[PDB]
């Protein structure tokens, strides 16, 4: 209860720091979600060392969005 | 009578009304007033307020909190800290020949040009406020640095609060 | 080569160029790179050239 | 959920929608007990009792 | 929580502030500003006349300084020494270096948990007082130790 | 003698602390990506060219808004005593914009409204006829 | 050709006078018309007379006035200081100097324009300073009762007025600081009709 | 209704008419018709003699009018300033603009919930009375705020 | 007498940091939008402006959703102007709409040409009282 | 065990190591209730329950 | 050079030495891992990782 009213206390700042609509592309599509990785090292077993510098992953593919999302779906 | 806006930049006179209400022992009021307006007592009152002072030999330094003595996110001034401002003027009246340097400092977050602009604006406002009491303009020089050096660390929340400051140095010769 | 205004009076203009070429330039006169000069205004810092451009203060 | 109103739906995303000649709006989507609208540039919430 | 420490061991901020009060009333200057701290000591109460040797009564004061330094957690401690103009420049440089080296060695011999000790002397290159009447009794002749409190 | 440090205020909250330390990294990421965008493509012109200022455009306003655009610019035109024009088809997807500013000029407010709109819509102003028009994006 | 002092109700007119320095003193209605490229370091006139000089290339000069003179000077003057105590009227077209200190006591009417790195001006009473088109990097204005100031500060503006004093700027400073004591006033005085006029920004928006 | 609110926050029409009666006894004029409400304030209790500077006593009246504007719900409020002719047109136009600007900034700093606040001052181009004997003492110098209550 | 601070003062240091972070991200997003925004020039923008004929000054109400030819025939009939066609209609003709209560014919046709975009345009001649509907090849 | 921190694990050995662009480190390894790191040149231990 | 994924760990604890000998001890502890260069005319101290694997 305390954290919910404290979250509600600063409503405009959440919208200020999170705006999906500025990142919404012109055909009403959410940009896809990615992840990065720098200086990866895997030791699978003996006699085998795998080393990579950078790597990237598409987590979620892009899709249509009727309306832009909000912080209330993620932090409330 | 008194004006909370800086007494219209007029010379304050507390001891006259102090000895008036003491007569209503005028000499008792006078010795009480020279006790109260003394350097030790005004330093004690400025330490009751949130103002830091350090004397180290001859160079003397004054530290003002931006977040409490300023209007927020602006070069505008906080207004309620006018008794602390009057105490600042009364203390700095005692050094009528010292050369003055004034500087501003902020935290780590934002554009470097933005921090430099904000610190320069705050330092220039402090310079103009000190000049507004009639001090000669060649006696002072203002500079607003960004996050070049801070007395605390910016990773800690309270230390990053401590990082922004107003610094007033003055020599003796 | 661009030029800029430094001092402006009603009637006469004081202009120094980008490389430091000074000019006590009259309203009826010839200017290099722009032909002649058409208009001089003091309340707004705008000088009209005969080549068809407005030259102002720097920024 | 089928909702007839004159406001602008914000939170859950609607699946289909229509507008009148009056400009009043009809939205169709799934169910949720909460709703979000922008009334006059100001955000407001709505409770769906009886869901 | 019963098996976890409530505080850092050997810590009492009341003792810290009262011994800092004792230090300032003994005139050894302690500067607290932000997370950074400075301690300045006059050399006339510590060493001989232009000499890198110690009076025996100074060891109690040095023990008190080390005991105060026990109360904090640190990373690096910087030691500088300063003097007045006596004969040359190099003479004062080496005297300040020797004095700072000796006090750094004794502070390391005492068990204060520091990772890095830096030490140097500067002679009389940077005064802190324009009034330079005195010799070894001048306030510019001094020894400074600086650090920043880590968390 | 008591010893104080001049930052002293009301007590904070840990969730506020966590939000601030997340948001500073978010803002730093936005700053570096804006630097990358500026260095990878140069600016060309300014929207002050298509929308210049004029007289009676300086009656200032402090504005908070988090909704659609049509009634907002209608209020702007009614305050400005200007003719208002709507051009193009309103899209099925509503365009929602947020503005929080204090005592600015109306032309600059229109310009930042245009910038927040982006490719969805544009604003043109003809002060000789005192007409402000909002044109939609003829797309899809 | 080193000195010229005139007194006693005469008119002196000359042209094409080249000099490194001459000591000029004017009194008792010296009607002076000069049309030469004069380089000089010191000039003095009492007042109650007109003087029109075209062409001055001076590395340094200093003028003190006591009467009520009317002076117009063409050329380029690297000026230092000015003090006015009567009913003076002065106009200088171009001045490329660095630091100026101006004191005005009774009545002054000065027409100045040029480049100034640092300027300070004190006004006491019934004193006018129309320093429009005079660009100052640092501007300091201190005005007592019944003072008129029109400034053109570009970067850093500092202004204080006691009572019934009008200070009007004509350029948007990067940094602005103004204060009024009893009835002072500091105003913007722009045109509202410029097609490329800038408004208040984040850093200079100090609300009066 | 046990969980749903019965009224808006801080609502009492007796207090509304009480502060209206007290304000009209003070001298500031409150106009009410249909949905539109106006408030006219003379410059004598607000500013000094033709200057955009606030006396210290004005802030109690500022807090009172902020308390009155806290009572209702509205979208857009507009403040218009009027004055007398003193030297020019530009001087009093800039003066009215500055006074309207600073009072709008203070009102927006205060927590009266409105989305848009327009601030303007026309100088002296729309007089109300031909009785122009006074200057700032003349009642044509004024500041009035207007809004329409929505729902 | 008494002056009060604003109610929503950022008294907390974390609130101050959050607010300036919001300021920074808003400014950064504004810079992103400014560097992204494509601006057509207001001079050589291809939009037929108001020709300002006296027949075009009338005000009317029109609701329509469909083709363009009979619509502009009605407009030319109301303006008492002749009308001509250049080009041919495609297989799929113009599908446009306009619904308004009080509008003048000049900006009605300007909105018509804006909805037309690129495949067709119009030209107005008030010297010889005609309107021409031009297709694209 | 999967561990995210900004510190440098020393003792128990890890199966894979991953790094961010902002001083953050992640490791995966076998299960252990105990760890040993170096914080700022000083070596420290770590106790983890719930295993 | 880039930081290798396997960290480079140095254990040195001595008392009251000059920094040049300190750096020489550090480079000897590194061995084939890294090298240390100092150019005092330009007042620049640099390290260099091993270009390997």
Numbering used by the authors:
A (entry chain FC): 77 to 152
B (entry chain KL): 42 to 65, 88 to 236
C (entry chain Kf): 208 to 266
D (entry chain LH), J (entry chain KH): 311 to 361
E (entry chain JK), H (entry chain KK): 38 to 188
F (entry chain KD): 23 to 162
G (entry chain KM): 113 to 320
I (entry chain Kd): 24 to 160
Paper text:
Legionella pneumophila is an opportunistic pathogen that causes the potentially fatal pneumonia known as Legionnaires’ disease. The pathology associated with infection depends on bacterial delivery of effector proteins into the host via the membrane spanning Dot/Icm type IV secretion system (T4SS). The Dot/Icm complex of L. pneumophila is one of the largest known T4SSs. The Dot/Icm T4SS has as many as 300 protein substrates, a striking contrast to the H. pylori Cag and B. pertussis Ptl T4SSs, each of which transports only one virulence factor.
Using 3D variability analysis, we reconstructed a total of five maps that displayed differences in the way the outer membrane cap (OMC) and periplasmic ring (PR) were positioned. These maps led to the identification of an approximate 16-fold symmetry about the center of the dome positioned within the OMC. Within this dome there are 16 α-helices that appear nearly identical at this resolution. Indeed, a model of the C-terminal domain of DotG generated in Swiss Model using VirB10 as a template fits into the resolved dome density. However, we have unexpectedly uncovered that the Dot/Icm incorporates only 16 copies of DotG into the OMC dome out of the 18 DotG copies in the PR, giving rise to another symmetry mismatch within this system. Based on the structure of DotG modeled within the PR (residues 791–824) and the homology model fit into the dome density (consisting approximately of residues 857–1046), we hypothesize that DotG extends from the PR to the dome, though a physical connection between the two structures is not observed. (A) Two DotC were observed in the maps that were reconstructed during 3D variability analysis, one which contains an N-terminal extension (DotCLong) and one which does not (DotCshort). In contrast, the N-terminal extension of DotC was modeled as two relatively large helices positioned near DotG and bridging adjacent asymmetric units. Notably, this portion of DotC was only observed in either four or five of the 13 copies of DotC observed in each map. The movie shows that the OMC dome, OMC disk, and PR of Dot/Icm T4SS can accommodate various orientations in relation to each other that suggest that the complex could undergo a ratcheting motion, in which the dome and PR rotate back and forth about the central axis with the different regions of the complex tethered together by the physical connections across the symmetry mismatches.
